Amino acid sequence: SEAFHTHSGIGVPLRRSNVDTDQIIPAVFLKRVTRTGFEDGLFAGWRSDPAFVLNLSPFDRGSVLVAGPDFGTGSSREHAVWALMDYGFRVVISSRFGDIFRGNAGKAGLLAAEVAQDDVELLWKLIEQSPGLEITANLQDRIITAATVVLPFKIDDHSAWRLLEGLD
């Protein structure tokens, strides 16, 4: 495991709300018993469209996902976090997460940063009109930076501990 203190990377604007575990990683990918790379399962159904955001340069090298509300809503699988992480995402931003997802994220090294929806809208606009704009998430200070916009995020303190300490 690696310890999470700050992460900067290309932001990916995903205007999808209420994203369920089987959209994050379809069921057909979770018969694998191994632990090697789940990156090819990440959004695999949606990736069939060449215009899906994650297929477009430079978003295909993104590591900060800016999603709509209710990301990972409902029941979800550990593999959803593994798929995100294996693809290279270290941060997911949403104004509300599913709780099971949110807990799994912190336990696996993924920052699930809760940001007010008005601020999610600003982040989408910035990265949409400047593809490749980096987003920074600073866990010590619990802020997201994009250009000259700086905004707070929330995380529970237990998750923060696990992430900062790099716990398995």
Instruction: Note the total helix count.
Output: 5
Determine the strand fraction and express it as a percent band.
15-25%
Give the quaternary arrangement of the chains: monomer
CATH-assigned fold name:
Aconitase, domain 4
Q: What's the total count of β strands? A: 7
List SSEs in N-to-C order. EHEHEHEHEEEH
Inertia-based shape:
globular
CATH class: Alpha Beta
Note the gap between the termini: 6 Å
Derived structural class = alpha/beta
Largest sheet: 7 strands, mixed
The helix content, as a percent range, equals: 25-40%
Please, what is the CATH homologous superfamily?
Aconitase, domain 4
Summed up, the domain count is 1
Strand order in the sheet with the most strands: 4-3-2-1-5-6-7
Q: So, CATH architecture?
A: Alpha-Beta Barrel
Radius of gyration: 15 Å
PDB class: lyase
Keywords: Leucine biosynthesis, isopropylmalate isomerase, LeuD, M.tuberculosis, Amino-acid biosynthesis, Branched-chain amino acid biosynthesis, Lyase
Assembly: monomeric
Entry title: LeuD_1-168 small subunit of isopropylmalate isomerase (Rv2987c) from mycobacterium tuberculosis
Give an overview of the whole structure.
This protein has helices spanning 21-24, 78-87, 99-108, 117-129, 157-165, and strands at 6-14, 64-67, 91-94, 111-114, 134-138, 143-146, 149-152. 27% of the residues lie in helices and 20% in strands. The chain has a single domain (1-168), classed as Aconitase, domain 4. A seven-stranded mixed β-sheet has the order 4-3-2-1-5-6-7. It is built from five helices and seven strands. The longest helix is centred in the last third of the chain and has 13 residues, at 117-129. It has 168 residues and is of the alpha/beta class.
